[PDB]
Design a protein around this motif. Sequence first.
Motif, PDB file in Angstrom:
ATOM      1  N   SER A  49       0.811  -1.216   0.000  1.00 39.32           N
ATOM      2  CA  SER A  49       0.000   0.000   0.000  1.00 39.32           C
ATOM      3  C   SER A  49       0.847   1.270   0.000  1.00 39.32           C
ATOM      4  CB  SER A  49      -0.960   0.008   1.195  1.00 39.32           C
ATOM      5  OG  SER A  49      -0.387   0.680   2.304  1.00 39.32           O
ATOM      6  N   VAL A  52      -0.657   7.084   2.485  1.00 40.08           N
ATOM      7  CA  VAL A  52      -1.638   8.129   2.225  1.00 40.08           C
ATOM      8  C   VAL A  52      -2.254   8.555   3.550  1.00 40.08           C
ATOM      9  CG1 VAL A  52      -3.709   8.782   0.962  1.00 40.08           C
ATOM     10  CG2 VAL A  52      -2.102   7.146  -0.042  1.00 40.08           C
ATOM     11  N   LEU A  75      -6.844  -0.204   7.178  1.00 43.91           N
ATOM     12  CA  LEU A  75      -7.335   0.667   6.121  1.00 43.91           C
ATOM     13  C   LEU A  75      -8.290  -0.035   5.164  1.00 43.91           C
ATOM     14  CD1 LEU A  75      -3.819   2.147   5.284  1.00 43.91           C
ATOM     15  CD2 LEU A  75      -5.603   3.359   6.548  1.00 43.91           C
ATOM     16  N   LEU A  76      -8.339  -1.366   5.182  1.00 46.62           N
ATOM     17  CA  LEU A  76      -9.200  -2.088   4.250  1.00 46.62           C
ATOM     18  C   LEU A  76     -10.688  -1.801   4.434  1.00 46.62           C
ATOM     19  CD1 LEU A  76      -7.448  -5.583   3.946  1.00 46.62           C
ATOM     20  CD2 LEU A  76      -7.791  -3.895   2.127  1.00 46.62           C
ATOM     21  N   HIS A  78     -12.326   0.926   5.433  1.00 42.62           N
ATOM     22  CA  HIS A  78     -12.679   2.237   4.897  1.00 42.62           C
ATOM     23  C   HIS A  78     -12.571   2.261   3.378  1.00 42.62           C
ATOM     24  CE1 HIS A  78     -12.891   6.551   4.275  1.00 42.62           C
ATOM     25  NE2 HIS A  78     -11.713   6.505   3.681  1.00 42.62           N
ATOM     26  N   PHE A  87     -18.810   2.198  -6.581  1.00 43.51           N
ATOM     27  CA  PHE A  87     -19.402   1.171  -7.431  1.00 43.51           C
ATOM     28  C   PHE A  87     -20.900   1.390  -7.609  1.00 43.51           C
ATOM     29  CE2 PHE A  87     -15.871  -2.091  -6.401  1.00 43.51           C
ATOM     30  CZ  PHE A  87     -15.096  -1.551  -7.406  1.00 43.51           C
ATOM     31  N   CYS A 120     -14.030   3.248 -11.881  1.00 44.01           N
ATOM     32  CA  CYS A 120     -13.760   3.871 -10.588  1.00 44.01           C
ATOM     33  C   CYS A 120     -12.484   4.702 -10.635  1.00 44.01           C
ATOM     34  CB  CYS A 120     -13.669   2.803  -9.499  1.00 44.01           C
ATOM     35  SG  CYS A 120     -13.046   3.402  -7.909  1.00 44.01           S
ATOM     36  N   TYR A 142      -7.485  12.590   0.597  1.00 47.67           N
ATOM     37  CA  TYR A 142      -6.494  11.515   0.615  1.00 47.67           C
ATOM     38  C   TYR A 142      -5.199  12.077   0.037  1.00 47.67           C
ATOM     39  CZ  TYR A 142     -10.778   8.805   1.165  1.00 47.67           C
ATOM     40  OH  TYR A 142     -11.993   8.322   1.597  1.00 47.67           O
ATOM     41  N   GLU A 154       4.653   2.927  -8.950  1.00 44.83           N
ATOM     42  CA  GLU A 154       3.455   2.098  -8.916  1.00 44.83           C
ATOM     43  C   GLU A 154       2.589   2.416 -10.130  1.00 44.83           C
ATOM     44  OE1 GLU A 154       0.707   0.466  -8.140  1.00 44.83           O
ATOM     45  OE2 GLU A 154       1.695  -1.113  -6.977  1.00 44.83           O
ATOM     46  N   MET A 156      -0.611   2.183 -10.941  1.00 42.51           N
ATOM     47  CA  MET A 156      -1.883   2.881 -10.768  1.00 42.51           C
ATOM     48  C   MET A 156      -1.670   4.344 -10.400  1.00 42.51           C
ATOM     49  SD  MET A 156      -5.207   1.912  -8.423  1.00 42.51           S
ATOM     50  CE  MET A 156      -4.164   0.535  -7.975  1.00 42.51           C
ATOM     51  N   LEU A 157      -0.668   4.631  -9.569  1.00 45.77           N
ATOM     52  CA  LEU A 157      -0.369   6.023  -9.249  1.00 45.77           C
ATOM     53  C   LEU A 157       0.212   6.747 -10.457  1.00 45.77           C
ATOM     54  CD1 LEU A 157      -0.546   8.192  -7.269  1.00 45.77           C
ATOM     55  CD2 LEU A 157       1.549   7.410  -6.151  1.00 45.77           C
ATOM     56  N   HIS A 240      -4.453  -5.748 -10.281  1.00 44.62           N
ATOM     57  CA  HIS A 240      -4.902  -5.414  -8.935  1.00 44.62           C
ATOM     58  C   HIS A 240      -6.153  -6.176  -8.525  1.00 44.62           C
ATOM     59  CE1 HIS A 240      -2.081  -1.950  -8.837  1.00 44.62           C
ATOM     60  NE2 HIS A 240      -2.203  -2.114  -7.533  1.00 44.62           N
ATOM     61  N   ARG A 243      -4.535  -9.113  -6.808  1.00 43.40           N
ATOM     62  CA  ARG A 243      -3.957  -8.724  -5.500  1.00 43.40           C
ATOM     63  C   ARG A 243      -5.056  -8.677  -4.448  1.00 43.40           C
ATOM     64  NH1 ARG A 243      -3.738  -3.617  -3.953  1.00 43.40           N
ATOM     65  NH2 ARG A 243      -2.551  -3.025  -2.092  1.00 43.40           N
TER      66      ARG A 243
HETATM   67  C1  LIG Z   1     -11.730  -0.484  -6.732  1.00 42.55           C
HETATM   68  C2  LIG Z   1     -10.594  -1.013  -5.901  1.00 42.55           C
HETATM   69  C3  LIG Z   1     -10.081   0.003  -4.871  1.00 42.55           C
HETATM   70  C4  LIG Z   1      -9.542   1.267  -5.531  1.00 42.55           C
HETATM   71  O1  LIG Z   1      -8.668   1.189  -6.392  1.00 42.55           O
HETATM   72  N1  LIG Z   1     -10.071   2.454  -5.151  1.00 42.55           N
HETATM   73  C5  LIG Z   1     -11.293   2.599  -4.355  1.00 42.55           C
HETATM   74  C6  LIG Z   1     -11.061   3.524  -3.161  1.00 42.55           C
HETATM   75  C7  LIG Z   1     -10.614   4.905  -3.618  1.00 42.55           C
HETATM   76  C8  LIG Z   1     -10.270   4.894  -5.124  1.00 42.55           C
HETATM   77  C9  LIG Z   1      -9.385   3.706  -5.492  1.00 42.55           C
HETATM   78  C10 LIG Z   1      -8.051   3.805  -4.758  1.00 42.55           C
HETATM   79  O2  LIG Z   1      -7.555   2.915  -4.118  1.00 42.55           O
HETATM   80  O3  LIG Z   1      -7.515   5.031  -4.876  1.00 42.55           O
HETATM   81  C11 LIG Z   1      -6.273   5.298  -4.162  1.00 42.55           C
HETATM   82  C12 LIG Z   1      -6.159   6.805  -3.953  1.00 42.55           C
HETATM   83  C13 LIG Z   1      -7.252   7.336  -3.024  1.00 42.55           C
HETATM   84  C14 LIG Z   1      -7.228   6.739  -1.637  1.00 42.55           C
HETATM   85  C15 LIG Z   1      -6.040   6.580  -0.942  1.00 42.55           C
HETATM   86  C16 LIG Z   1      -6.012   6.025   0.332  1.00 42.55           C
HETATM   87  C17 LIG Z   1      -7.195   5.615   0.928  1.00 42.55           C
HETATM   88  O4  LIG Z   1      -7.297   5.058   2.169  1.00 42.55           O
HETATM   89  C18 LIG Z   1      -6.093   4.885   2.909  1.00 42.55           C
HETATM   90  C19 LIG Z   1      -8.410   5.765   0.233  1.00 42.55           C
HETATM   91  O5  LIG Z   1      -9.523   5.333   0.902  1.00 42.55           O
HETATM   92  C20 LIG Z   1     -10.770   5.417   0.220  1.00 42.55           C
HETATM   93  C21 LIG Z   1      -8.408   6.323  -1.037  1.00 42.55           C
HETATM   94  C22 LIG Z   1      -5.093   4.726  -4.909  1.00 42.55           C
HETATM   95  C23 LIG Z   1      -4.608   5.348  -6.051  1.00 42.55           C
HETATM   96  C24 LIG Z   1      -3.520   4.822  -6.721  1.00 42.55           C
HETATM   97  C25 LIG Z   1      -2.889   3.681  -6.258  1.00 42.55           C
HETATM   98  C26 LIG Z   1      -3.363   3.060  -5.112  1.00 42.55           C
HETATM   99  O6  LIG Z   1      -2.769   1.932  -4.612  1.00 42.55           O
HETATM  100  C27 LIG Z   1      -1.577   1.469  -5.231  1.00 42.55           C
HETATM  101  C28 LIG Z   1      -1.001   0.270  -4.495  1.00 42.55           C
HETATM  102  O7  LIG Z   1      -0.792   0.400  -3.272  1.00 42.55           O
HETATM  103  O8  LIG Z   1      -0.770  -0.757  -5.163  1.00 42.55           O
HETATM  104  C29 LIG Z   1      -4.454   3.589  -4.441  1.00 42.55           C
HETATM  105  C30 LIG Z   1      -9.068  -0.592  -3.905  1.00 42.55           C
HETATM  106  C31 LIG Z   1      -9.489  -1.160  -2.708  1.00 42.55           C
HETATM  107  C32 LIG Z   1      -8.573  -1.713  -1.823  1.00 42.55           C
HETATM  108  O9  LIG Z   1      -8.895  -2.285  -0.624  1.00 42.55           O
HETATM  109  C33 LIG Z   1     -10.266  -2.277  -0.242  1.00 42.55           C
HETATM  110  C34 LIG Z   1      -7.207  -1.682  -2.115  1.00 42.55           C
HETATM  111  O10 LIG Z   1      -6.309  -2.246  -1.232  1.00 42.55           O
HETATM  112  C35 LIG Z   1      -5.361  -1.348  -0.660  1.00 42.55           C
HETATM  113  C36 LIG Z   1      -6.781  -1.121  -3.322  1.00 42.55           C
HETATM  114  O11 LIG Z   1      -5.432  -1.150  -3.548  1.00 42.55           O
HETATM  115  C37 LIG Z   1      -4.947  -0.483  -4.707  1.00 42.55           C
HETATM  116  C38 LIG Z   1      -7.710  -0.579  -4.202  1.00 42.55           C
END
Ligand SMILES: CC[C@H](C(=O)N1CCCC[C@H]1C(=O)O[C@H](CCc1ccc(OC)c(OC)c1)c1cccc(OCC(=O)O)c1)c1cc(OC)c(OC)c(OC)c1
Length: 267
Positions: A49, A52, A75-76, A78, A87, A120, A142, A154, A156-157, A240, A243
């Motif tokens: 993770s 953030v 953090l999972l 939330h 969704f 999303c 965030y 990463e 996705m970032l 992902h 994962r």
């Molecule tokens: C649809 C699936 C979802 C997801 O993608 N969503 C949904 C939530 C906000 C938007 C996006 C996300 O995650 O946006 C975030 C940014 C916004 C954010 C940040 C922290 C938060 O809380 C502390 C939070 O809380 C709402 C929202 C993001 C952006 C780029 C890379 C990211 O991860 C890269 C990596 O670590 O590999 C994460 C997801 C769920 C997970 O567990 C339930 C998860 O497990 C960790 C996960 O890992 C990637 C993804």
Amino acid sequence: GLTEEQRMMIRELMDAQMKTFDTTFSHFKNFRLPGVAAKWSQVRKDLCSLKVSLQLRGEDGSVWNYKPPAEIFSLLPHMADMSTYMFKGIISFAKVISYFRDLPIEDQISLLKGAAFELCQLRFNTVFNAETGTWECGRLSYCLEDGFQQLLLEPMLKFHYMLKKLQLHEEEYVLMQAISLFSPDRPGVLQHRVVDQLQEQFAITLKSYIECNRPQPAHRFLFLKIMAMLTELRSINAQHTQRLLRIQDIHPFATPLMQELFGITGS
Ligand SMILES: CC[C@H](C(=O)N1CCCC[C@H]1C(=O)O[C@H](CCc1ccc(OC)c(OC)c1)c1cccc(OCC(=O)O)c1)c1cc(OC)c(OC)c(OC)c1
């Protein structure tokens, strides 16, 4: 020029986005918050993770700030609640489109299960601040904690930073949503011929929209940049998804709606 059938396509997509995207997150309440050889290598890598910090601004001016351990199980819940809220709006966005409603109910479920993550990320990119590294979600924030080059490693970032640097219009964002949703190569779809023709019409409209509204040389190859980014989003989506399903098998966290989109039955 834009044909009347192309202007109607964008208008229905934009009207669909306006009715199902709460940009202020005003209806996101009652959510949980963090508490007050190989395979080992994958488990450790999947539970990494990004660092953030969370901010929750109260209506009275008070501010709650959460800083993560400088593990991710706190953090999972939330993140799963926000995923479910996102969704719900995405599923509503698809069912208000005439093209999506006209598909079989099995193909509607197959398309939604394959594009829910991508739609999303596309919607969350519109509330992302690339200059401050912050996803501003109404009274929620965030913020990425400390550099940028290592954070942009990463995928996705990196996808969020690159898509924001393109400075796309709202109509281009909603056309990427249509192209991702109407993907004929999603597993389980039966009307692949209809979905493929719909995607091609959405892509042509996006190409024609860019040519009729962005004559600047900075927007050269912008349509191909968008199409290449949508291809990378499907690879991030497939990576992902694996994962999260490995985390779910170790530490269950997925909400009922998230289980439906993942294919989980409850055994
Ligand atoms: C649809 C699936 C979802 C997801 O993608 N969503 C949904 C939530 C906000 C938007 C996006 C996300 O995650 O946006 C975030 C940014 C916004 C954010 C940040 C922290 C938060 O809380 C502390 C939070 O809380 C709402 C929202 C993001 C952006 C780029 C890379 C990211 O991860 C890269 C990596 O670590 O590999 C994460 C997801 C769920 C997970 O567990 C339930 C998860 O497990 C960790 C996960 O890992 C990637 C993804």
